[PDB]
């Protein structure tokens, strides 16, 4: 296999945000974290001045600014997910802008158990040292050589640097087998060992989750849980328990004023709160500000403006008015930034019938759930909010409408029924219906329902492809989870139908004993229920298989035919020793895979009306999505933000092993893939597979010849010498296949981003690289490489996205 | 009647030697539907019947 992967759309999810004086001690900068991308914005009176966007050879996990001893401006600390660290300084050289790596290094240790609470990176206020918590019972310290110190507390929740102490001192919240408590520890570099912390509180709330150290005028640390918000400063102890917080746990924050009198707090659901200090300190007081997108990170800007960093929905710029608004909120949204992530499904449509192809995604979650329309002609973005969770999508041209699996949250009232949290598309439908089935009404059992908590109800929405208006909503049964969706014609019937696979989920029954496949037809603004077919398991996936419907039921793969009675006739069956979750087809071949990378490849034999096992390969690892490249090669995604391709085993001199699959492709993408689909966004490369991520990243993968692969390999190795590498991180190390304990160099995949960067280097760099390369234009004439030949080849390669 | 012929596998007590040997042979197996006339063992009990009927005649 010889493949090429390139970024088509940079990530849109916001995983971090900080403000500081980076471009100059007087300038005010805004820093945005977008997975592999880092953005620098300057705070203006009207808004934010965009300055620079860069790409890193690492997944940004920690990002904090600091002002070093006797230095011009704030310096930046960054740690990658692969544990590469780098320190950056903003450099202007006339018209050229550069980010220099003042120091770099990797802080990995071969042996270490990563803590449950993840990576944490903090810097002391004096900017003397950097604290890192990567593995339990160890604490790395950098004053880029580093040293570890032992920790008897093996379950750290959160830790921060104290203000106003004789030496840098840390205070943390741990959970021991006797409760949850807070503690302190002092640092001695000269000793490279721990000293005694100034104080200690032997008990704290069982759900303590956030620790914030208040600056020097106050000192101490703020502790926040579900029920209690406490303050501790040696022997000073304060505590409050406001009601407005029990609905959602406090998750993200930011310091408002440098004197430390006001804090911002956001919940898991988009409510934004402010912490006010009534000053010694007398008491604490909390106030609701309003509702925002679910916030991953928050930053107080200035002029009553706060930046909303969101992973689930669009980022927002909001104003903080001294008076509340008529709905009760003090916040109003000023400007929104497009966010494509998370992407749970997508489809490609040539809406204008121009041979183009437009990308339409089911994106977001909860009230930020939305459809995203992507148009190339660079990429154009239209946003259509849905206010509930989208799941799956398919396109039906004859009806000029989309089918979308949707789910909304409701809470149990006290009136017997349930109430929605907010208006959504499923309650704004022009027409509505709820299916009724005696077959599943035949389920009679105990079902003690508590009355005051959440529950999921799934719905099917039908929406016009032009206006994107809610045409029709069909509600699914109680305890029924909408899983699979497909639109296609069957048998001799020329009508086009929507087929939906469902399952019944009950809280005390793990393995699903029940499920449905329901066929729908959309006519004159109404969805007519066609048929009902009960199966004894969950209907995970369905795929059009040449006039027939291939369906997955738990670990069973069943092929259904279309009867003349407009029903499904079970033709044949194939039982697998794994749960048949992922299902992709091409022609008569059938590839089946589970969640744990267990691959299973079948081929339907029409002469006997059944399936034959062609090959099989098990390699235990979490798998997120899988796709077929061609008859002999298949692409998958497996944890570790990693991609893999396995071969159909060409010419194995082993009859019993021609059914075994090798491993010819491995690649570290840096993104978590959820769905693959064939298509291209335009009118030497073969094939085309687009994929969407949780961070909204979009790339294109196509196949190459051995000559094309071999040529680009030496070019990449050459470019790695000349391209200025962020943090001096090697591309071979970045793209290395990496599990939490293993590492192996990638092969079979060309990093199209790095290839395209060739056009943006100075012309002297190009000639330097091309020199001493043996060139083959194809079939005829092997010579030395021409500086030009690559460029015009490179452009025709760029003309894929 | 004191059964001094014990089987090392299961422990069965037998009153005569030759009865114990008949026991330890059944411990082994090899499709244990042995026909006593010919010794042809069969994999199932119904195929023994169809095989047994060829044995009387």
């Amino acid at each position: 296999s010889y493949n090429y992967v390139v970024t088509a759309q940079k990530p849109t999810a916001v995983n971090g945000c900080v403000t500081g004086h980076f471009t100059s001690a007087e300038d005010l900068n805004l820093l945005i974290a977008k997975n592999t991308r880092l953005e620098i914005y300057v705070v203006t009176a009207e808004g934010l001045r965009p300055v620079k966007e860069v790409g890193m050879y690492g997944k940004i996990a920690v990002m904090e600014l600091f002002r070093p001893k006797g230095e011009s401006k704030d310096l930046l600390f960054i740690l990658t997910a692969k544990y590469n660290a780098c320190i950056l300084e903003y450099k202007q050289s006339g018209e050229s802008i550069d980010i220099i790596t003042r120091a770099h290094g990797n802080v990995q240790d071969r042996i270490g158990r990563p803590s449950e609470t993840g990576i944490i990176g903090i810097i002391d206020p004096e900017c003397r040292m950097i604290g890192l918590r990567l593995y339990d019972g160890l604490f790395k310290v950098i004053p880029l050589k580093a040293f570890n110190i032992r920790l008897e507390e093996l379950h750290v929740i959160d830790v921060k640097f104290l203000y106003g102490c004789q030496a840098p001192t840390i205070c943390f919240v741990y959970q021991d087998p006797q409760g949850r408590h807070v503690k302190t520890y002092e640092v001695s570099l000269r000793e490279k060992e721990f000293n005694k912390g100034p104080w200690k509180q032997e008990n704290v709330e069982a759900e303590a989750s956030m620790v914030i150290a208040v600056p020097e005028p106050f000192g101490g640390a703020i502790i926040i849980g579900q029920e209690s918000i406490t303050y501790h400063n040696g022997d000073k102890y304060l505590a409050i328990a406001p009601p407005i917080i029990k609905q959602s746990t406090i998750v993200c924050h930011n310091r408002v004023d440098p004197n430390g009198s006001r804090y911002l707090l956001g919940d898991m659901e988009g409510r934004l709160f402010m912490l006010l200090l009534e000053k010694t300190l007398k008491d604490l007081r909390v106030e609701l500000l309003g509702e925002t997108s679910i916030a991953e990170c928050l930053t107080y800007l200035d002029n009553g403006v706060v930046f909303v960093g969101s992973r689930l929905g669009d980022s927002q710029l909001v104003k903080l008015n001294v008076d509340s608004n008529e709905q009760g909120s003090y916040v109003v949204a000023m400007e929104t930034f497009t966010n494509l992530g998370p992407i749970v499904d997508m489809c490609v449509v040539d809406l204008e019938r121009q041979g183009q192809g437009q990308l339409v995604t089911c994106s977001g979650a909860f009230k930020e759930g939305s459809l995203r329309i992507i148009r190339n002609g660079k990429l154009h973005i239209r946003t259509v909010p849905l206010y509930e969770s989208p799941r799956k999508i398919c396109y039906q041209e004859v009806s000029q409408c989309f089918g979308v699996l949707s789910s909304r949250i409701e809470v149990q009232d006290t009136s017997g029924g349930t109430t929605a949290l907010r208006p959504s598309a499923s309650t704004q439908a022009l027409s509505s219906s709820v299916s009724s089935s005696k077959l599943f009404s035949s389920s009679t059992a105990p079902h003690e329902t508590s009355f005051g908590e959440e529950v999921e109800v799934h719905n099917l929405l039908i929406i016009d492809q032009h206006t994107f208006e809610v045409l029709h909503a069909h509600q699914f049964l109680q305890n029924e989870y909408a899983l699979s969706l497909v639109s296609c014609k069957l048998g001799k019937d020329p009508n086009t139908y929507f087929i939906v696979g469902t399952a019944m989920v009950y809280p005390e029954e793990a393995e699903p004993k029940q499920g449905r496949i329901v066929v729908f037809q959309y006519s004159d603004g109404k969805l007519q229920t066609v048929a009902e077919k009960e199966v004894k398991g969950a209907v995970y996936s369905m795929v059009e298989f040449n006039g027939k419907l291939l369906a997955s039921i738990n670990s069973t793969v069943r092929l259904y035919e279309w009867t003349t009675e407009k029903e499904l006739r079970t033709e044949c069956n194939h039982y697998n020793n794994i749960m048949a979750l992922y299902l992709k087809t091409k022609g008569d071949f059938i590839l089946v895979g589970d969640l744990m990378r267990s691959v299973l490849l079948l081929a339907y034999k029409p002469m006997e009306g059944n399936f034959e096992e062609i090959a099989r390969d098990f390699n235990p690892n979490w798998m997120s999505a899988v796709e077929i490249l061609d008859d002999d090669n298949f692409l998958g995604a497996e944890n570790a933000f990693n991609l893999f391709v396995c071969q159909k085993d060409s010419a194995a001199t082993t009859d019993e092993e021609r059914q075994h699959l090798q491993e010819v492709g491995l690649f570290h993408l840096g993104e978590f893939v959820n769905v693959f689909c064939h298509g291209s966004l335009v009118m030497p490369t073969q094939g085309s597979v687009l994929f969407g991520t949780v961070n909204g990243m979009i790339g294109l993968v196509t196949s190459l010849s051995e000559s094309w692969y071999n040529l680009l390999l030496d070019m990449q190795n050459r470019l790695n010498k000349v391209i200025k590498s962020v943090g001096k991180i090697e591309h071979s190390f970045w793209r290395s296949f990496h599990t939490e304990r293993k590492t192996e160099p990638a092969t079979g995949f060309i990093d199209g981003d790095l290839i395209e960067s060739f056009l943006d280097i100075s012309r002297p760099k190009m000639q330097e690289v091309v020199a001493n390369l043996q060139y083959d234009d194809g079939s005829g004439m092997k010579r030395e490489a021409t500086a030009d030949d690559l460029i015009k080849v490179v452009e025709e390669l760029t003309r894929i996205h | 009647s004191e059964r001094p012929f014990h089987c090392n596998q299961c422990g069965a007590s037998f009153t005569q030697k030759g009865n114990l040997l008949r026991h330890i042979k059944l411990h082994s197996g090899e499709k244990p539907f042995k026909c006593p006339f010919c010794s042809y063992a069969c994999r199932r009990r119904d195929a023994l019947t169809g095989h047994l009927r060829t044995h009387s005649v």
Partner: protein, 372 residues
């Protein structure tokens, strides 16, 4: 001491060690050959490790994998004039057959490649939001018998740890079928039906050793035990064990396969040792014997005897299959009246399989036998 992964190693092979070993399972062994001692009399200085094999068709000697064993006890004498030599061995790293050298006398050496133990992190490490890493840890577990008997507590658990699973194509309760803690609980709910020993301390928290402790208590086939060893993923190993404990319940004669002996409901743990354990007879034959309350379709052989009884206070009587007369085990009958079960049965596993009940319902005949 343990060998590094994938290493090309040469290990002795012990003849007449006919079983399939699962790592950590202890093995007492009766020796009689001087060659068995001749291997041990040197092995004990000092490796103390050989290679238990996994024969599929031992009469044709078909084996493909196995489990290294670490001889951890060895001390013996010639008391009452009979020279007696017994050792306790324990299994360690799984392996795969490559080449084999039957040396001069027996001395079958094993050219072997170590099998790597494949550890996998949680399902959330990729998609879990950095903001909620503080929320990952729960306010611990109540370790009780009331909110575990109730499921409301665990629902909130399943709700929280996979809250960010809403960013995938798959909902939470699916990952519950891959959550080690959930799968352990599903087993932490089945063996209290079987055993009264405290799960809490006796079981290990780590699923690796916990998977092998489940594997050394299930009366399953020799072949089922085999592909159970092919499974590097402790998670897959648990689901396979689980779906076995769901389907594979009622046990039949391995040889005739026409006689339903007993059901898994009839299993019970007599002592803290467990329901199934390895017992030895006075001739060196090792029996993985299971204890069950009731069994049927068996004939008894001979009179009961207390001689060398593994359960003092009970007299055993040989039991064999009604149809094929192959040995199934023993009927243990109490000697006194103050004995608790009075008639606890007791079957040897190598003749058993808790087979799929081919339900004789004319409306529910066959079904699906996905051996996962």
């Amino acid at each position: 001491t343990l060998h590094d992964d994938d290493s090309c190693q040469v290990i002795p092979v012990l003849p007449q060690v006919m079983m399939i070993l699962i790592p950590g399972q202890t093995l007492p062994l009766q020796l009689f050959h001087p060659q068995e001692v001749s291997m041990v009399r040197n092995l004990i200085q000092k490796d103390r490790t050989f290679a238990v094999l996994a024969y599929s068709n031992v009469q044709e000697r078909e084996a493909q994998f196995g489990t290294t064993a670490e001889i951890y006890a060895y001390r013996e004498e010639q008391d009452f004039g009979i020279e007696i030599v017994k050792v306790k061995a324990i299994g360690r790293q799984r392996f795969k057959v490559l080449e084999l050298r039957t040396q001069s006398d027996g001395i079958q050496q094993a050219k072997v490649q170590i099998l790597p133990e494949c550890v996998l992190p949680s399902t959330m490490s990729a998609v879990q939001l950095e903001s909620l890493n503080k929320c990952q840890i729960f306010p611990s577990k109540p370790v009780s018998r009331e909110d575990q008997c109730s499921y409301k507590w665990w629902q909130k658990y399943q709700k929280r740890k996979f809250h960010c699973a809403n960013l995938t194509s798959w909902p939470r309760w699916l990952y519950s079928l891959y959550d080690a803690e959930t799968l352990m609980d599903r087993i932490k709910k089945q063996l209290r039906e079987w055993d009264e020993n405290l799960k809490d301390d006796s079981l290990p928290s780590n699923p690796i050793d916990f998977s092998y402790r489940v594997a050394a208590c299930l009366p399953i086939d020799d072949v089922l035990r085999i592909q159970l060893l092919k499974i590097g993923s402790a998670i897959q190993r648990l689901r396979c064990e689980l779906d076995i404990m769901n389907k594979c319940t009622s046990l039949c004669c391995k040889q005739c396969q026409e006689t339903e002996i007993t059901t898994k409901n009839e299993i019970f743990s007599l002592s803290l040792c467990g329901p199934m354990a390895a017992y030895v007879n006075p001739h060196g034959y090792v029996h993985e014997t299971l204890t069950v309350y009731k069994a049927c379709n068996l004939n008894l052989i001979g009179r009961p005897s207390t001689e060398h009884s593994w359960f003092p206070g009970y007299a055993w009587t040989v039991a064999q299959c009604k149809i094929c007369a192959s040995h199934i085990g023993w009927k243990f009958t109490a000697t006194k009246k103050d004995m608790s079960p009075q008639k606890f049965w007791g079957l040897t596993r190598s003749a058993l399989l808790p087979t799929i009940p081919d339900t004789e319902d004319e409306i529910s005949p066959d079904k699906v036998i996905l051996c996962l």
